[PDB]
Amino acid sequence: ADFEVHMLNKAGVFEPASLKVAPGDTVTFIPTDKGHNVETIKGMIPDGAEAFKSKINENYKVTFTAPGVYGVKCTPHYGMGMVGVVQVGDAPANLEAVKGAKNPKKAQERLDAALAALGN
Ligand SMILES: [Cu+2]
Numbered sequence: 001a002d003f004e005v006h007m008l009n010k011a012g013v014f015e016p017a018s019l020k021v022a023p024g025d026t027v028t029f030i031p032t033d034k035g036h037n038v039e040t041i042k043g044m045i046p047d048g049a050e051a052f053k054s055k056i057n058e059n060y061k062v063t064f065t066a067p068g069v070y071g072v073k074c075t076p077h078y079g080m081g082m083v084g085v086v087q088v089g090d091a092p093a094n095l096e097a098v099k100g101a102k103n104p105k106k107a108q109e110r111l112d113a114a115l116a117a118l119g120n
Contacts, residue, residue: 003027005084007036011077014038014084018114021064021088028061029054036074041083043101044071044111046094068094069120071101071111081106085114095120 005027006015012033021027029038038060039053046068053075054060064070067089074082081104095115103111 001025005029005038005086007031007033007038007074007082009033011080011082012036012074013082014072014074017084017110018117019084019086020090020118021086023065023067023088024063025088026061026063027086028059030059031057035076036082037076038072039075041071041073041078041101041103041107041111044069044098046070046088046092064088068092069098069115069118071098071103073107078107079104081110083107083110083114085111085118087118087120092120 037054037056040051046066048066069092070086072084
């Protein structure tokens, strides 16, 4: 299945900010507003996943196959808290590593909230 995640100004937000998908699903990240991208956060993707970083203002499609939680950021707006979470499958095995990851404060508060929203 195919999902969209939009980057929007309300520094902006990922909408949805938390997203659960199954292994093999695809997410397209779409910067509706200018100035945004998506990039994985170091230490916040599961084993077997590849890091990725899209170009500013480009639509970027990722097929998610490795299970676990993925923390993602907009590269320039990371410090302001523009971040999201994609969870692949139902019982993520990397939760300890991701909860241990250091982030800017505002990024941490949003990451924590997105994780909570997904039941973790
Ligand atoms: Cu941004």
